[model samples]
Structure formats: C-alpha cells, structure tokens
Target chain A: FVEEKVREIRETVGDSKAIIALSGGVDSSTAAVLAHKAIGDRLHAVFVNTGFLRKGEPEFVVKTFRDEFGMNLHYVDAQDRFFSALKGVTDPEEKRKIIGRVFIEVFEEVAKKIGAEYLIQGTILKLIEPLRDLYKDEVRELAKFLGLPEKIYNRMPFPGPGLAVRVIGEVTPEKIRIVREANAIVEEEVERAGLRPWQAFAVLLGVKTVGVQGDIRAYKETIAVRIVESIDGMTANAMNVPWEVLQRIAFRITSEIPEVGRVLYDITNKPPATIEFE
Target chain B: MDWGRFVEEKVREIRETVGDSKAIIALSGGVDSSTAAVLAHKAIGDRLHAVFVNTGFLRKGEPEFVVKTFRDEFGMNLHYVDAQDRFFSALKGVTDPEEKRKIIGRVFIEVFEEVAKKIGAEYLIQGTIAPLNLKLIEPLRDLYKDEVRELAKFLGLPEKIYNRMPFPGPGLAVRVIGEVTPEKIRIVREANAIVEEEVERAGLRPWQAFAVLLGVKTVGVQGDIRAYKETIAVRIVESIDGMTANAMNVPWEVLQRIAFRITSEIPEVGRVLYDITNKPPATIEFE
Candidate 1:
C-alpha cells in the first residue's frame, strides 16, 4: 500500500519539482525517504528550525539526514526569529497559531527558493479518520474529488517539533532544557524496562520556588514527567512505569540539572489530564 | 424622622446607656464596616479605633481606598499594616478551601491582635452585618447585601463607602485560579467590574455579581479555526444572605456586552461565560 501511494505521488508530480519537510521524526523521515526513492533529485528536503524545539534538535537532524539518509537537504536556522515573535504571547491557542503560521511561512519561502510547485506534508489517514473525520479510507477518494493531486500524500501526523507544545506554560530556554533532559531519561529508562514504542517526555510548568531538603535551601524548578503507550498518535493510556524506573529518571534529572530539584510522575489519564500538559 | 436620623438617635441611646465603654471595630472597606465605623465614631469619637489591617489579599488600589475613606473622608481613626509578602508566603501550596479560609482567618487574628495591643481597646467591634452573620453562621443573620447597604446609608455613612459592594475578604485572589499573580488578580478585578457594570446597565435588580476564573480551558473556534482558551465564568446571584442564592436571569445583550468588554480588556482571559449554575451542588468557589 505504501509503495503504491509513493508511485501515485511520483506520477502525479511528474517532472515538476517538489519539496518535503524532513524533521528526522518517524513520520517525516519515512515520508522524505520514500519521496526521495520515488522521485530521486526531484524531491528537495528543507528543515526549518523554529526556536521552540528540543535541545540539540537542529544538530541531530543535520547529522541524521547527512550521514544516514544521504538526501539533498537545506537547513534553515531561524530560532531567534521565531522566539522574538513569540515573546509576551501567553495564550496557548494564539501561540499554536503563530507557530503554525510561522512554520508554513518558512516552508513556503524554502519551497519558493527551490522553485517547487508541490509541497508535501506527512499527514496520516488515521489522523483524519475518527477525531477529524469518520471515514479514514475515503480521505484519498475525497482528495481526488476535490481535484487535489495525489502527490500530496497524507502520511501520519507527528507534530514537527516533538514535545514542544506539550510542555505547556511559559516556553523558556531553561525550561526547554529541563524537558529535553527528562525526555531523554524517560526514553532511555522506558526502553531499558522493555517498553519500546512508548513515547515519553516532561512538561515544565514554569513555576519556580525555593525549597529546602535536609537543611539545604535550594532554588529548584519542578517538571511533570509523562509516559504513554499508544499505537498511533491518537488514543493513548498513561504507562505504568515502575517505581525504580521513575526513581532513576528523577535522580538523574535532579543531579544532572541542578536547577530541576523536584520531579513528579503524572499518573492521570486522558479524560482528566490530556496527553499534552498544556 | 428619616432613617439616618433614627439610626443617629439609636447610636446616641446606645452610647448614653453604655456610658463610655470601649468598643473595637473591624473596619473592612465594605458598606457594613464603614457604617459600623460611623456609628462607633458617633457613639465615642476617639475611643473607636477603626482598625483596617492590610491582610495582603485586597485588590489593587483597595488599601489606599480603605485608608482614604476612613481617615480622610469619614475622619475616623485607622491603622494600616504592610504584610503582603507575609500573606502570600503563608498561602503557598495551599489549594484547599477550608485551609485557605483558616489561613486567612488566622493571619487576620494575628494582625488584629497586634493592632489591638497598640490601640488598647476592650472589645473588637466588627462590622458584622446581618448577611455576613448568616454567611459566617453568626447568631445575627437576618439581613442581606442590599439591606446592609440600606442600614449603612441609614447610619449616615458617606455615599461612596456605603454603596460599595460587599467584597470578599480574600478579594480578587479567590476569583483567580491556578497560580496567584498580580496580573491574574487584576484580570479578575476588571472582569468583576464589567460584570457589575453590565448587570446594572441591563436595568436588572442589583445583587452580588463577580467573575470566577475557571482554570479549565475549553476548545473554541476563532476566525473559523480551532483554539483553546481559559474560560471566565461570570456569576450574578440574588440572596438575602450569602448562605443561599439563585442565579440571575441577565439579558443576553447584557451578557454579550460583558463578554466583549472582559475579553477585549483583559488579556489573560480568552472567553467569557455566564454561569447559570445555582448554589446547591456547586459552591461559589471552584476550589
């Protein structure tokens, strides 16, 4: 089915140049690689770096595509530009809109430079089915009826900047650093505990206070760690990570990140607490 | 004789019978306290130390108003304390309702005791209106907010002080949810202002009206797209006392005006909702 869709995409785009955004995540990475295999040089890849990204993200993406995938890539470093625009804006919806628009603009600019007539997004059929639409298989049929070329293939939905919006509260450099560290620890421990494919991350609340432990006054930040098991991005349940796994993550986070003193595990489910802390 | 003259006569009678006995006054800036301050002042001018403690939870510009009203406008003795940091520090990590009340009450007592020592008064004369008596479960619990306002006017208190709504001791702090910040408190205060102004603008009978910031964010569509924003629930209720009440049937136009003003003026809030929930299963405070 994936091969057939790739062929269809290539046939539709036909001799026209196309650009795809490659974020090194599973969805975008798979989409980019598939497009490269299908159309070779006709598929140009661009990665725009929004300031609101995980720690070491830009470098990781650069190394991944250059070393592993061997695809033609354009890297845009616009972190400062993005953060400057987002300053003083606190509403979550407004923030999402601004970030989304800025991302589109960045992609559009790169696509324009490359003279690509078609823009490829890694949107999945499952994403459009239940929560978005009832009939998942009819998405392609509807796209065809709407005169949309099959080149714009809907892959799966994975927010380009993984775990960025999920962190919630004020987005600061320090908070992002803590979240990244906690996410890495969660990933490591979850895999060690034989719980692969379960996504995990930390959400920084941006609340600060002075806490004392054993007669030591410490100015430490607090972060809520979340690990959930899921097949796709939709429908998830909070993972019951063992106490030892959590303890290890917490100890490492507190010791490595001196600023983060308090770490908490979020056991709440989707009904009460959404997957994203925001 | 007018009600004001009658109340003045009652004050004189109480003073003549009591014969120069000392009385303490917990002079909150609301109508009840101002009336009590005036009555006590009439009964024993210098003996009534109208004590107004800075509980650190008052809305912005409130402490100044209390002082200006009592000392400058009414010519009553007033005491002001600066304990903002103390109050906020004590309230850290306290999310329980009863605990919050107990903390506030305990701090108030401590401040009052310190002030009482300074003043050397015998009895703490509270502006305990009949409504607050009911809300606090006090023995005297017959009057309501409006009736207290009437009693205040009858006591010959100044119009500015007597007409003021009965503000909660926690002030706008209780109205705000999540973390308590000066900005959030200001938003609640401004939203409360709009609620009050719109309720009066609709020509409806005046009652206790305020805005509660529900920490819950609801998904909403703006400009034909999906977004999430903090929900602000505006409540206007009528009651003889603070104990029980029914939600007011405010006109849709009035609600729209309030919603527009609150969302446009207050940056923290995203949407405004008129709370139709009554006071049976749900208490006034969300916590």
Candidate 2:
C-alpha cells in the first residue's frame, strides 16, 4: 500500500514540491513519511507554536521531526500572534475561532514562502490520503511501521485549538503557563501509573475561589483533571481512575502550583458533558 | 479554657453592655448563634429578640429545625422572617462570585435591620467568634470555634446544636458558585442534604460536608438521552478551625454513594466532582 501511494504520488506530482502541516500527531507524521517516500526532498512540513501547546511540545516536535527524522521542517514560533489575538476573549467558542484563524494565517505565510502548489492534507483521506482507510490504532501501527519516532506512534489526540480550549475562559500568557504546568502533572502521574486513558489533561477553571496556601489566605484558580476513555472521538466515558492516582495528581498540582488551590476530577461522560470544559 | 467560667463572664458582659435597651441577634441555629441567643437570653431575658431569616437557601427542613430547637425547646424569643422573595429578587441577574456574596450579605443585613428597626432594638448581637458587622455584641469573640462548641455544651445546648458542621453566614449562597436563584439553591440544598446524609450513614463525620453547584454545564446522559446539565462538587473537609481545612479522604465507596445519589435524585445535576484541594487553595465554600 505504501509503495503504491508513493508511485502514484511520484507519477502525479512529477517533480513539483508539496507542503504538509505537521502537528506531530500520528496522522500528520505518518502522512509526512509517506509523502517523503514519494517525493523525498520535494515535501516541506511546517510546524507552528501557537503558545497554547502542552509543555515541551514545541521542543519535542522539533527534536523528533527536524533533528531525528531529518524531514524538511520549518518550525514557526507564532505564540505572540496567537496570544495577542486572544487577549480579553473569554468565550470558549470565540477563543477556538481566534486560535483557528491565527493558525491558518501563520501556516499560510509559511506555505507561501515555500511556494508549494500541491498541499498534503494529513489523514484527510481526500488527496494523497495514504492512511485514509486506517483506524486510529492502525495508523499508530503504520506510524511504527514507517520507523517514525515512538512519540508520534503513540501520541494522544490533542485539540487543534490546543490548550486554548482546555482553558475555560480568557487566554493569557500567565494562564497558559499555569495550565501548561498542570497539564504536565496530570500527564506525568497518569503515565507513571501505567494507566493509558484516551485523553488525560488538566483544565484551568478560570474561576477564583478562596484557598489557603500556607498561613496567608489565597484567592486562586481551580484545576479539573479530565481523563476519558473512548474508542472514538464521538463518545467517551470518564475513566474510573484509581483513588491513589487521583490523590497524587491533586496533591502535586496544588503543592507545585501555588496559584492553584483546588483540583477536581471530572466525572461526567460525553453525551451530556463534553470532555473539554469551556 | 474553662468553658463554665467563660460563659459566666460573657453573661455578665452582655448585661452590662446592653443595659436597659433591647438587642436583636441573627440566630442561624449554629453553635455560635444558638449559644449567643441562649447566653443573651440568660442575661437580658425577653429584651433579646432572636431573628431567624429564611433566605430560601437553607437545607430541607432547616427552618423547621431552627424553630423546634430554639423557639419551642429552648424557649428563646425567636422571630421567624420569611424573606425569601426579598433575597431572591436582590440576587437576580448577578453572576460574579464576589457580587453574589455581597448581595447575600447586603440583603441579609437589610432583612435583619428591618426587624431590628421594627422592634426598636438599639443593639445587635452577633454569633461571631473573632468576626463582626453591626454595632456588634460578639459574645464568642475571644473564643476559638472549638472553644465556642465547648461553651455551647456547658450552657446546655443539644448535642446536635453543639457539634453541628459550620454553615456560612450567607447560607447556601456561598455554596452556589455564581448566581443564587431558587432552582439553583434547591438543587444545591438537596445535593448538600444528600451529601450530609450519605456521609453520616457511612459513619464518617467530616468537619464540613456539603455540595456546591457549579454555574457551568457539562454534557451527560440520562434515560438514554443527552442531558446537558450543571455539575455538583462535594466539599467534605477536615479542619482544625474555620481558617484552615483539608479535603477528607472519604472511602471510595462512600464517595461513589454520594455521587450516585446526587445525580440520581437531583435531576439538574448530571455530574458530581469531589473537591480535593485543601484550605490554602480552596475554601470550604465555593464562593
């Protein structure tokens, strides 16, 4: 299948270059490998840092794709463009819309600079859909089969709007930093326990409640730990996380982040409550 | 602390401060207020009018409990103020946490002050222990929370009255995160009742056991249909005093029971969360 796609791409595109947006997820990374096989140095990949990504995501993506895989990757640090556009915007839908718009604007500029006519859509299964018929797990297997980095093969599905959606209200640099730290704690604890939920992350509730940090009174934020298990994105169930693991996640978050005073486990499923809090 | 000697000193102090004028106390039926009412009644007799305002946020049968315990049994001069409408109106369209607290506090004083003015009471007695507001006569001012409970027992208050969990002065308004509407209050009150009942049934008595109604809604499923509804967060804590607290490590089964009953019984709440943050990070109350 991989050879057939490579042959077809080589015949169709001939010697022209194609550009693909790499989000470091399985679909994009796998698609990048397949396209590379077809047009070797002719394929260009662009990665943008929206400032809302998980902790170390930018570094990890650069290290894996540019450093290790040796793909023709352009890493764009557009965090300021995204965060500035999101200032004072509290609505979830608005935040998502702004993020989407900014991402496109940044990606378009990168694409224009590369002057690539044929666009490689990752996992779209439309044009150059190498893994179109594959399931999520199958794509992971193919990613492994392609000798892509292990991180790409087993990456969790992250929202395109990134941590902007994970934050309940306004997106600020301060808030982004705090949620980034909290998200790292949740991911670390869950991984350490060897419990792999479909999606596990922390949300900054954006509501300030009274708490005590030490001897002084603190008016700080609340963090919600959402770990959901699902076969598909359409439906999800809150994972019945072990009590001890939940406690550790809670303890570490409050103890490590002085700005956060409370941690809550979201026990609602997808049908009524969406996995992500607005 | 010699609670007996402490009560004696407070009783004399109350008599000297009030003199010949009438004084009113906001009797919340908690240890502080009830003890103050009892202690003040001993000092000035019927000159002390205890006003109990039902802000429509109390637990199920809370009004009845206060009337029974204070008015009928203790024989204090208790006046019941049904100011539910006044409070509900004042809280309308309010969503900010601080605004909600201020409205509740301001409206409470408005109602209490009306009663005081009607009766021509010149002095106001508060159940505050190291706390204040009116031309306040805080009898338990110097005592710690546990010390107040000791005094309540020494003064012959009932076991339930003396050992009751602390309820915020603004009542359930503090427990409901944003707006304080009748429906939200009902949901939180019922949810809180379920939390209290289940915690007790499981033989676990935390310092404070209640449920908070988060203003936001989450997606859920009930009866095979999509139910988008508000969430409830259970706050059961262990505290040395009101200043600091830790979320109680209630057994998993007990937490499961509390969660199940809250969702099953309270139809508006499709999800439940257990607050795991301590005092420094999360106060016992949501507001």
Which number leads on lDDT?
A: 2
Clash count, candidate 2: 11
lDDT of 2 by residue, A1-278 (tens): 78888888788777888888888788988888888888988888899998888888999988887787778999999989999999999877788888889989998888888888687876641256666778877888888888987766887889988888888767888998999999999999999999988999998876667654464445678888989898886888777788788889988998898888779887666654677776
Instruction: Return the TM-score for each candidate structure.
Output: 0.48, 0.83
User: Which one wins on TM-score?
Assistant: 2
Instruction: Please report how far candidate 2 places residue B208 from its true position, in Å.
Output: 0.8
Q: Identify the leading candidate in terms of DockQ.
A: 2
lDDT of 2 by residue, B1-287 (tens): 57667778888999999999888898888888888899999999989999999988788888999999888988888899999999889988887777877888898888877787788887888788864234678888877777887888888888888988877767888788777788889899999899999988998878899988877676566778766678888888897766788777788677777777777777788778788777655567775
Stretches off by above 4 angstroms in model 1 are A1-10, A55-57, A125-158, A161-163, A213-218, A231-235, B1-287
Q: Ten residues in a row with the worst lDDT in model 2 chain B?
A: B127-136
The positional error of residue A231 in candidate 1, measured at the CA in angstroms, is 4.9
Which lDDT tens digits does candidate 1 get at residues A1-278?
Answer: 44666686778678887777766554455556656666778878898888655656677777766555576789988776667666666667677777888888777777777888776655551011111221344554544443332322232233544555655555565566677777677667776887654457776645333334332433446566767666655566556565566657766776676676555554333322346655
